[model samples]
Target chain A: MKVRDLMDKNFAKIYVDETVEDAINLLKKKKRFSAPIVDKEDRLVGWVTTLELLGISEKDFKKPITEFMRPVEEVITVYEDDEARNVVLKFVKYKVVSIPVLTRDGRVIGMVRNCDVVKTLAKLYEIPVYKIFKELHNHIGDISWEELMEAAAVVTKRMTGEDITPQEYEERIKKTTFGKAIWACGGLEKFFVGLIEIGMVALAR
Target chain B: MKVRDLMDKNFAKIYVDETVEDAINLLKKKKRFSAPIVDKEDRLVGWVTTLELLGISEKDFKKPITEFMRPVEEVITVYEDDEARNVVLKFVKYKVVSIPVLTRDGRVIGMVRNCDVVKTLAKLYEIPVYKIFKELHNHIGDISWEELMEAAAVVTKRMTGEDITPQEYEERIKKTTFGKAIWACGGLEKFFVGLIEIGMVALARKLAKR
Candidate 1:
């Protein structure tokens, strides 16, 4: 598949003249950790992340985003027609949240995020969750409260096709068989594997 | 595969009492984007990234890293024996460069980085480079100088079985067929797929660096 197939075209464009505060608000509003900065002509010029701006003082919040963004030379990009696997490699190699997708003429059209690549790969193949389950069962008390909750939410969506909030998953875990198993067995993988298998098998049929 | 199988055990440890400059220097030396911060007893206390420290002033550089780190409550962690796929998921959903690997008792032992998960997945499945190639040919003049150089380096290593640096790849690109084809075709995918296939055929024996 091409990046065009996976790129999100409806992203909020961060302009070069925009303030740091504007960039922060736009990023928070869009729930994106990073985004591409564009010129007045809508061409890709740079990129920004919340992490890069975390150090910004209130005085500099009104300064231009260009002051903080990684310039075009440092920012990695993808062509709409580039092989999607390149997106995967870029993500792995560069470790960025998203890569901007540009048209042949250099117009900033959209972006392919790390999640986009993961979802595509997951949908394309049977990711080895079974193996993860096997390993998860052997370890206990290593997981944090947030990790369990987040993983539970991800598994809940993948298994039941229900997109519940992590908070809701926490509440549901209090009463479910998987919840009880987690308490009894002191691990998350074994139960998650069984449940995921059931869901995947159900879908396969 | 398991998390232990892919986790990097040889990472540099960042202690909680360390100054911001110490963390910065350690991170730069290790070439890691982020690392787990541990306490005096070597238990995981928090996590720090280069981005988090970018805002520190010269005066603040001597301040403790705890001031810039994401405390344990906010940091996402993986167990050594947890599924490796969980590491991938955490990378995808949480957008962290690396997740700390902890013992059952919560001592930070190692880390699973984005590259680790990608390499593992690429090694496990026949990643669809062919599909990516077909799409790449249609686009022209969009990629940046750094991207082309970097992609060329990645493809060169995968294609020739020679782990050359990006600068070396840039030099080799001026003399190779794959390099010429890239200039003629104005894209990277077509030549990369062809060359990668040839290399894979040569190494049907499979290649593992470690």
Candidate 2:
């Protein structure tokens, strides 16, 4: 397979000169950990991740995104035609959540996240529930709370051969086998609740 | 990176029930250690590795490859979009030199070797020569005679920073700083020579380095 086959062509991007506040707001609104930083010509120049933004005081929000962005030269990236295994190795070696995909001319085309790979792998292999669960647990640290919940829902829905209504899903959260399955799927409830609370606070703002 | 980006689009494949003798010959002739085993409809069913072939007896040459083939069900594969790190972890966990790739419908598409992943990482990170050389040596194994000589020639030619005739390349090998610099790039000549040897042979034969 080629990168064009799997990359998210419709990706969100940020300019290097964008404010930290803008990047942070975009991240929270989109629930994304990283965004490609592009030059005026729309060429990839660097990337900014949540980790880079962490610990900034509210006073620093107006700083240019470039002040905290990892330069492209310093960040590891993969070419569009490079092998999938190689891309994964870079992530593993560096312990980064996402790696940018570059064109032959070093232009950023898209990004590949650990979640994208795992979900794709699961779908590709027709992975069994046990295997999927195992992989999910093993890669739990890398996945987002939303993904964990979605996977749990899918697994439960598949295993029980039933559609779970949203209300039932919430009501049975502490009681049913599916609920326990959700816990095994990595305790994503806190993540959901946290997001809800944040949303409520943002609405008040 | 996505699997599509890194996977070799053109790869060799074989049927599941092909004779061991034919498979071995194909392997020897093509220099590939493993081939995707597909069913009549072109759905992948398993894979056959060189190491698996080595376990067969000379008398068993005529035996069907299915008799010794490893099932795809038993082979772990990653999707084209899977994180490269997770794929490497799967490779390390399985301890397999190469892993098969499949389409959503289970058709064989490509394969990944450990060396390919290492080289990709090297390029992605702009890894130093020492690191690349060390990684190249580790995954490829001991170099053979033809490989060492070819690598020496290529290295010598590149180091000279000039186009030289094949005849001059041979003569230059004996006295060229470029030739010696290839050896000097890394502190270990024996190691670099071994890598060159293995890489050349693998390249020449279109084989996956075992």
Candidate 3:
């Protein structure tokens, strides 16, 4: 769906003139992640994570935040109409913790973080089956993490440098003759496998 | 699965005596994520990522890895018997790119990286259905991400510390008087309307601090 449904409308913002101290202290008590920095009119400008804050000197703490921030140009963003699935891909590509949701006019509408996208992705997928316990047990919980990761690399080889999908899967999984990739599980379908479609209640439970 | 089965046995390593220059060049062509540092006897000492290499001064390039390498004590590692599932959790928890695999005797063996763990997580949970597109779509592809996250927060408010399972519909969804926590979605135990299972997934997801 649209970003409006997944963003944190009330996230904290660090305006252009604010000091590093304003952010350092705010983070201590407020618990916000990826706090966005903005210009005079509320458009996205730069952003900060606790990692960035730690590098600030005590003198720098009182200096303007814009000096050390990752300016908006460096950060990718989403508009109000962008699909949630697309949002998920961006998270993977950027390795970013959060993204700003901007209105058509460039006004900062909200923030979409990984936690937001993951919850959405989890809700977006529902199961139709799980027929064989041994198969699944062989896949994740007891499944070899390294083998699965090797599979992820094969997918990564096939899907890198572009957004990826399913019909592409039929050929890709069996063999990734070409190259690909997400911030999350190699994509729900890639990892889920044929066992993914089993019914849970017996006639397909 | 045991880590020995998952560990990359033929993986790359550097001796304590190897020069930093050897590492920087090897990394450019080989793409090994962690070049495990070892002693003359081939035991683990510390590991180094490419990030650390970028900071080496030109003059220091000839210095032994032992001079600048981070000791293994600073990094987390896995034992032979550790479950693959727990290894996945540690990946997320530690924000580690790769984990060192040690023998019961503590010699470095191989590593388990995020790709392995993620692929494994995905493989573990599969669906029994994707039967009706609209119904499935109604839950995920078409559902609102914000609403699901908002609902997750409510559960977060309810179940911050303790683990929980389902009790009722209304209480688990948009509101919660007490934080509580799963089941039956995708016929595979995924998204269901009550938001019960969502809480378990959501709670567990955030528990990975990194």
Candidate 4:
């Protein structure tokens, strides 16, 4: 599959002129690690990570984010038409969570993140979670969390017939055994790997 | 390689009894997203995240971090003997940056993060940057950082005769093509990929010792 198929066109971004203070508020509200910054043409410009503003004092908060953002040349982007494996290569090699998916003309279109790539790979192979979770059980804590995540995978397989959003899958799962995971502060995004399995609602950001 | 091989033994953590204010200060000092919470014995107990502390009321700042940490049961851990691919699986599936590595006896020894996994994978596959970074040039900033990183990588390849730590690898690079990246951050264990390869660090977070 291609990045475009996994991309979320409605994701968030900030303009280059925005200040670190502005960036902070926007990122806080979104609860995102970073925001992609763009030029006036809406082309990809750079990336601003929370780490860059880690110690920003209120006194220097108004400085432009470009001062700290990973400039355009530093970011790693994939073409919308790029293969899924290609996108995965960029991230694993770079250790970054997200990579922008761009238009051929270099306009920012969407992003492909670790979750998105894994979801696609899982779907492609139709891998079962029971074993993965079992193999990973030691690191994942409670066996029940593993059981719940595995069961959620079962739900994904059964719900293959439904056309739903990730939020809906989440809300729906809340009424099931999987709900416990979200309440644990592990959150649906981390525990519900199965839900992301179906895609659409994963939102590559 | 095993998780322990990739883990940062010197990684930061907070005690459960520590005040949230104190925990916040330490976390901010490291600029970490979250820190693993431990008991007196240093066994993993929970996680204290910036998100949990976000919007914290001043009145509650003195509360124990245990009050805010996502408890032990909620955390995920990998065995010290676990493979690199398994570590990658956890991060990719969970969307978390790091996972605590535990001993068979359940003591928290260290943690494996995205950087560790990528570095291991790079070694496993022996994938060269010439094509990887060369083809994806649009986002990595300018060819200069790329050339520097690539050159430093060349130095690493040649230093193949030496058994060096990542710190030395970073320092060696700083002295080589890596200098520009370090001069730019002010520099990691994050020397390039996790960051500067994209142009973010060249913020050093204050230690611009180049």
Residue-by-residue lDDT tens digits, candidate 2, A61-138: 888988888877767788888876566667667756567788888788877765445444334222233332333233
Q: How are the candidates ranked when ordered by lDDT, highest leading?
A: 1, 4, 2, 3
List model 3's recovered fraction of native interface contacts, to 2 decimals: 0.00
Per DockQ, what order, best first?
Answer: 1, 4, 3, 2
Worst lDDT 10-window in candidate 2 chain A: A195-204
Q: What is the DockQ of candidate 3?
A: 0.03
How many Å off is the CA of B125 in candidate 4? 5.5
Better of 1 and 2 by DockQ: 1
**Most accurate candidate by lDDT:** 1
DockQ of each: 0.08, 0.01, 0.03, 0.05
The fnat scores of all predictions, in order, read 0.12, 0.00, 0.00, 0.06
TM-score of chain B of 1: 0.58
Docking outcome class, model 1 = incorrect
Give a tens-digit lDDT track for model 2, residues B1-210. 566566655555777668877776666555455677788867878776654543234567778888878887787777766545556557645666467776777676777765455445444443344344334544443544345445545544544455545455344434433323343544233333333333543343333443
Q: What is candidate 1's lDDT per residue for B103-126, written digit by digit as tens?
A: 888788898865566556555334
Task: Give the per-residue lDDT of model 1 (tens digit) for A32-104.
Answer: 6678888888898888765567544567777898888887887888898898778777887776667888888
Cα lDDT tens digits, model 3, A1-205, are 5787888787778898998778766655555545888889998888887555532245576688887688667788998789765666676566565788888898888888655543443431222212122233232332343333343344445446434443343334344211111113333333332122221111111
What is the TM-score of candidate 4? 0.49
**CA shift at A158, candidate 3, in angstroms?**
43
Candidate number of the best DockQ: 1
